Amino acid sequence: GSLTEDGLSYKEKFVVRSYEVGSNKTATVETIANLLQEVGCNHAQSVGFATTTTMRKLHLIWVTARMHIEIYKYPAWGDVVEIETWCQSEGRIGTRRDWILKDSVTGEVTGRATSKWVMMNQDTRRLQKVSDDVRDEYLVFCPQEPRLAFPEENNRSLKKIPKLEDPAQYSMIGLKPRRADLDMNQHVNNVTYIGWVLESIPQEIVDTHELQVITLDYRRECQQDDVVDSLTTTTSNDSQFLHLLRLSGDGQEINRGTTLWRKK
Amino acid sequence: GSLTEDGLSYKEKFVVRSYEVGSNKTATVETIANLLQEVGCNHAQSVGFATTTTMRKLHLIWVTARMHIEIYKYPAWGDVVEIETWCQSEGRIGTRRDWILKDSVTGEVTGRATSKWVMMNQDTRRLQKVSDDVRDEYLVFCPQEPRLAFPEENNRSLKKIPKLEDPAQYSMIGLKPRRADLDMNQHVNNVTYIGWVLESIPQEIVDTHELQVITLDYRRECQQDDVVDSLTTTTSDSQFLHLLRLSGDGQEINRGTTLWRKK
Numbered sequence: 303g304s305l306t307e308d309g310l311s312y313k314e315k316f317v318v319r320s321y322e323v324g325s326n327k328t329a330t331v332e333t334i335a336n337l338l339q340e341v342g343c344n345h346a347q348s349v350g351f352a353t354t355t356t357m358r359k360l361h362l363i364w365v366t367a368r369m370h371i372e373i374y375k376y377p378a379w380g381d382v383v384e385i386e387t388w389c390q391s392e393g394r395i396g397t398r399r400d401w402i403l404k405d406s407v408t409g410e411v412t413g414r415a416t417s418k419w420v421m422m423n424q425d426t427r428r429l430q431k432v433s434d435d436v437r438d439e440y441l442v443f444c445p446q447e448p449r450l451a452f453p454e455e456n457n458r459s460l461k462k463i464p465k466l467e468d469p470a471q472y473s474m475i476g477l478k479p480r481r482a483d484l485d486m487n488q489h490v491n492n493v494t495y496i497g498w499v500l501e502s503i504p505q506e507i508v509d510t511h512e513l514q515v516i517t518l519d520y521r522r523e524c525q526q527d528d529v530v531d532s533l534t535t536t537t538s539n540d541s542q543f544l545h546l547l548r549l550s551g552d553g554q555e556i557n558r559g560t561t562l563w564r565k566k
Numbered sequence: 567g568s569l570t571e572d573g574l575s576y577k578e579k580f581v582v583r584s585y586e587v588g589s590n591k592t593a594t595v596e597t598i599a600n601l602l603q604e605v606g607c608n609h610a611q612s613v614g615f616a617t618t619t620t621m622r623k624l625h626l627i628w629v630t631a632r633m634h635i636e637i638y639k640y641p642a643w644g645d646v647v648e649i650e651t652w653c654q655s656e657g658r659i660g661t662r663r664d665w666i667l668k669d670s671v672t673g674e675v676t677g678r679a680t681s682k683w684v685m686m687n688q689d690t691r692r693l694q695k696v697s698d699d700v701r702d703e704y705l706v707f708c709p710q711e712p713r714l715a716f717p718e719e720n721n722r723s724l725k726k727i728p729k730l731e732d733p734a735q736y737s738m739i740g741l742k743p744r745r746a747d748l749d750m751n752q753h754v755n756n757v758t759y760i761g762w763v764l765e766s767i768p769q770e771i772v773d774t775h776e777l778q779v780i781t782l783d784y785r786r787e788c789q790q791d792d793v794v795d796s797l798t799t800t801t802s803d804s805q806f807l808h809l810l811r812l813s814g815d816g817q818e819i820n821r822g823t824t825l826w827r828k829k
């Protein structure tokens with residue numbers, strides 16, 4: 303992988319692996335999300351990091367608030383996918399990381415993603431606005447003119463997501479993370495939540511449809527010793543679902559999301 | 567990746583990814599097992615496949631009976647690991663696939679693995695001996711002289727594993743596979759079983775020790791809708807005896823052993 307000529311974005315190629323594919327011999331949405339994370343980590347490393355010098359001094363971290371992914375074509379096993387990623391400040395609200403996925407052979411856009419990140423104190427878990435000193439430290443690595451993966455006016459990445467009301471149409475109960483679901487800091491990987499959301503989609507939908515869009519809001523973190531319930535209700539040739547992840551015990555919300563599926 | 571000069575083995579390099587590492591910033595044993603599986607699949611593809619023409623005609627498949635992995639150094643995040651793999655017939659019993667793992671920069675061996683595979687009818691699930699016709703079409707892709715990743719006479723890869731007796735010292739119950747745990751044929755990936763075995767090792771062992779050796783026997787397959795209990799007892803470096811069994815009737819799915827070195 304490498305930073306592009308202007309040093310304001312990063313590109314990387316990936317060959318899709320045998321264990322990374324689903325029933326259609328194409329990459330799962332969790333494989334795609336892991337590749338978005340890997341290209342994001344390589345970009346931060348290439349520019350000197352995603353904690354800045356000031357962030358480490360104040361025990362501050364970047365946490366995901368929202369993830370939005372749209373896939374037009376899933377790469378097949380053995381195919382090369384090229385991913386370009388960049389960041390932008392969104393004032394004092396936080397930062398945004400965007401991605402464009404392309405078929406390396408044709409150069410055609412096969413997917414796009416956008417994510418909203420907020421600043422949080424590592425210890426107290428209290429969110430806070432971005433300070434000017436932090437904003438200046440990462441503006442030298444971001445394009446100054448706006449560059450959006452989802453530029454459209456009424457695009458799906460910025461829509462408000464409602465809370466699923468009981469009873470759910472579908473559910474998958476008692477979901478627990480294992481050690482493979484943890485990152486290097488022993489926190490549950492953000493991609494695991496995408497998997498848990500999808501666990502409550504009925505197998506007949508998975509067998510006859512392909513996932514086109516997934517929007518996920520992150521409200522609270524699941525601990526290593528927490529248990530999760532995944533809930534889904536159809537809200538609709540295309541099928542749409544409303545999703546909710548909540549702790550199995552008290553029903554505390556972990557995530558809420560929406561998925562859009564098109565018939566194969 | 568590519569077949570070596572003689573066409574009798576296959577090599578591939580991998581850069582260790584950020585999500586592939588554990589708390590020590592080094593590749594997990596499940597990342598290693600996934601890389602062994604990927605280099606195995608690429609080898610089969612490069613030689614024309616791991617079912618042959620005769621196996622497809624009779625609905626025959628290769629199934630894992632035993633996996634044995636020994637790691638001396640786990641590659642760090644960003645490091646390049648080179649893996650060489652080859653196969654060998656073991657008469658009518660089945661086939662063996664071996665691997666050597668190296669640090670790409672130093673050329674030093676950082677790990678090794680061996681696996682025993684048996685022939686099974688995909689429909690009835692009945693094990694069968696390897697026929698002459700199948701041995702013949704496999705032998706042209708295997709070294710004729712023996713080439714062993716674990717050559718030592720009476721090594722850890724060929725030791726008999728006993729059945730854990732109740733009560734277990736440690737346990738992790740109610741383990742269920744999700745869709746990410748399935749392969750392209752909707753069967754539970756063999757690497758998931760390694761993860762489930764390790765789930766019953768206490769966190770204090772994981773925090774103060776590194777996994778050096780894991781030997782795993784595969785007895786039965788876990789279905790998409792099955793629930794598993796993972797059981798561990800210390801038999802001692804720290805050594806453990808392991809058992810995976812269905813949560814309900816207690817039907818055995820796997821048995822294994824692990825050896826851990828103090829960090």
Ligand SMILES: CCC(=O)Nc1ccc(C)cc1O
Binds near residue numbers: 335338341346352492
């Ligand atoms: C260190 C750079 C960074 O933000 N990494 C990152 C982690 C998770 C996801 C989903 C996307 C990512 O880009």
Ligand SMILES: CCC(=O)Nc1ccc(C)cc1O
Binds near residue numbers: 603606756
């Ligand atoms: C298709 C070639 C093949 O044998 N692949 C394979 C699958 C699983 C494991 C654990 C190792 C492997 O090498």
